[PDB]
Amino acid sequence: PNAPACMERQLEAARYRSDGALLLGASSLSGRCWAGSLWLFKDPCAAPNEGFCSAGVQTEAGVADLTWVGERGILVASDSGAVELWELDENETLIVSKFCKYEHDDIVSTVSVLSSGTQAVSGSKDICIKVWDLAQQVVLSSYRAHAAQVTCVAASPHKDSVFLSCSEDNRILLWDTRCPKPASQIGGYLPTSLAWHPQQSEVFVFGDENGTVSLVDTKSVLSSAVHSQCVTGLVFSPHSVPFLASLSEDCSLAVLDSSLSELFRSQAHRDFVRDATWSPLNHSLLTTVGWDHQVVHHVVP
Template sequence: MENWNIPNINGDTFRNMLFSDRSSVVNKNLQFLLIYDEHNALLGGTNMNDLYWTGTIWHYNDISDFTRNKAAITQQMNNGICDAVYLGHNKFVVVEDSGAVQITEIVQLTNEQSEFQFLERACQHDDSILTVSGFSNKRNIVTGGMDCCLKVWDIEDLVATYSYNFAHTDIITSTDVKPMCSSEFISTSLDGIFKRHDCHLLAVTWNTVSDHLIAVGAADGSIALIDVRQTENPLYESVEFNRGIHKLLFNPNPERKEQLACCSDDTFVKVFDTYREMLPIFENNSHSDFVQGLAWYKDDLFSCSWDGSVIKHVVCSSDNNSS
């Protein structure tokens, strides 16, 4: 009976533990994948199976193999990481669940060795940042997250030059910028703006060629194609998944601008033809956990998942699929 009164010493141990004393977790839940070119790619993950949610960033100079031991640089972060965006082939921005924005540069030490150099860090959000997008001028980014606030940042000084505190009334889930523009962007939130009925919006992407066309994903598994010049009625809307949409991404190839890659809170990766009423042209169910990241490179689609794997998908053109 007396032992029941002993304080939980494990709690004190964890509270007083330094970051350097924590054991590293190799198998992270992968959150995002970015491919700048065939020699520059970033993979980000957050350990969600431990008392401390810490992140890891991997840089690859060869996109043919995304296994962890093939990474050119591996860097553990003090906080969980949610999203990232490239500023150039050797510079990128990572956003954290701590509400911080981190600018990092890849520095080449020798022909075979490189490292991350952390340039600037700022924390002006009041809660976790869930999404970041970069404008074409490579100087400004937009962030949004759980504090329901959108911020536009000047990367040169790493200050939030604009804050939209009342743009949404609930958690901001996704952002994307207008192609070849330094001032316009789109955002989605759990407040459900753009929908004709109440439904949480989880993902948005802007077509890189048809700059009036966006795709919006919702918690009911539906995807809506919307003309930003008249947002009252979607051009097309249909339920494509059994679970909420997590990420949408148009193919940046002008010759395949109609291809829309999608993943939900599930193991499926799908590609649709948006010019043919969301005709399915590709589907893969190889992942064993939720797919979180999508990245196009040339005509191939890459996906990463909480299962720790990265898979390359060969997507044929819509004409080849219909023949």
């Protein structure tokens, strides 16, 4: 449906929308052309089959990360140094580019929409963190707090001035933009992933390059060796008492409890596990994507 004839082998992102439509982001990290693509599946079981998508579009460079901006917007972290905004047309059959702003000097590695849904935060290999005004399509503030590549940025679920960042300089920074010195250092092995707890406002989890998952309270730590290699992502479930999914370069998926104990384990992926997303319809259903081009739908006990 006006979409590219074929999607790239390396699936980087997977995000369910409140109705249950699945957003996919892919890059070709090998071969002749190193570009990317954005895909929408209203039928997630059809994914990643191109002839059965609701809409699909090709990007100029690779998709390093993405996020939903409400129900129609798709914010993208590009290899180009651009932060791009795309929007589903009024018919949800075409993904149209809204803005492509080259503000970063290297690969945009991480992207996160702030609580209001009006602004966003990007992280890059250029060592900077930028705050974007999505409607004005401009950078509000640019921060060089780090001394190495920005690995991950995660906007507070409920506070529009608050976000986390982690980096190869071994710093985890808690930000509050209302402060004259906005960053504050929290606290080993390099931090690779971040996830705010959906219910506990001052609690977050972080993954490390050695396969460890840690539970951290701001006001005040619990830790487990979950993986054998780097923790790529951490995604809490939509349940009242959340479950925590962890994905790694060890090619496995683990679903953890409040005490970080393992309840589920999947070795379905033949390559690196890149993203995980919990179904908004069936809370026991968790979808993972990997570099093996697999979209696996897991039933979690």
